[PDB]
Design an enzyme around this catalytic site. Structure first.
Site, PDB file in Angstrom:
ATOM      1  N   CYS A  30       0.834  -1.195   0.000  1.00  0.00           N
ATOM      2  CA  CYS A  30       0.000   0.000   0.000  1.00  0.00           C
ATOM      3  C   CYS A  30       0.871   1.248   0.000  1.00  0.00           C
ATOM      4  CB  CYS A  30      -0.932   0.017   1.210  1.00  0.00           C
ATOM      5  SG  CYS A  30      -2.226   1.287   1.127  1.00  0.00           S
ATOM      6  N   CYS A  33       0.046   3.791   2.962  1.00  0.00           N
ATOM      7  CA  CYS A  33       0.639   3.250   4.180  1.00  0.00           C
ATOM      8  C   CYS A  33       2.091   3.671   4.322  1.00  0.00           C
ATOM      9  CB  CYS A  33       0.536   1.724   4.186  1.00  0.00           C
ATOM     10  SG  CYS A  33      -1.097   1.106   4.609  1.00  0.00           S
TER      11      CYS A  33
END
Length: 111
Positions: A30, A33
């Site tokens: 991600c 993230c």
């Protein structure tokens, strides 16, 4: 620095914590993230002795995100005395997270 929590260590690192824990759910794939990842290492040190900031990797530790209904990442959840009290989905500026933890802390003190 942040505490890396697994499924095996979640109840000891988080639900039995004597302090608010900010659990951050992430995955190595991600992008957001990785955008907020520095911000939480700064908050980890800025908020030492006030809030533990934990990181749970949803690809290595599936049970803990299942149990709390994670549908997207990043997901940040605040825990207090074994209970999940609040959450935030998606990347977010460092100052918005402080504002959120400030209002989480005020609301917990008035209940």
């Amino acid at each position: 620095s942040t505490v890396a929590v697994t499924d095996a260590t979640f109840e000891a690192d988080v639900l039995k914590s004597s302090k608010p824990v900010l659990v951050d759910f992430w995955a190595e794939w991600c992008g957001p993230c990785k955008q907020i990842a520095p911000a939480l290492e700064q908050l980890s040190e800025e908020l030492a002795d006030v809030v533990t900031i934990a990181k749970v990797n949803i690809e290595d530790s599936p049970t803990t995100p299942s149990r709390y209904g994670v549908r997207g990442i990043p997901t940040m959840m605040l825990f207090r005395d074994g209970q999940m009290t609040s959450m935030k989905v998606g990347a977010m500026p460092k100052q918005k997270i402080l504002e959120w933890l400030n209002e989480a802390g005020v609301q917990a003190a008035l209940e």
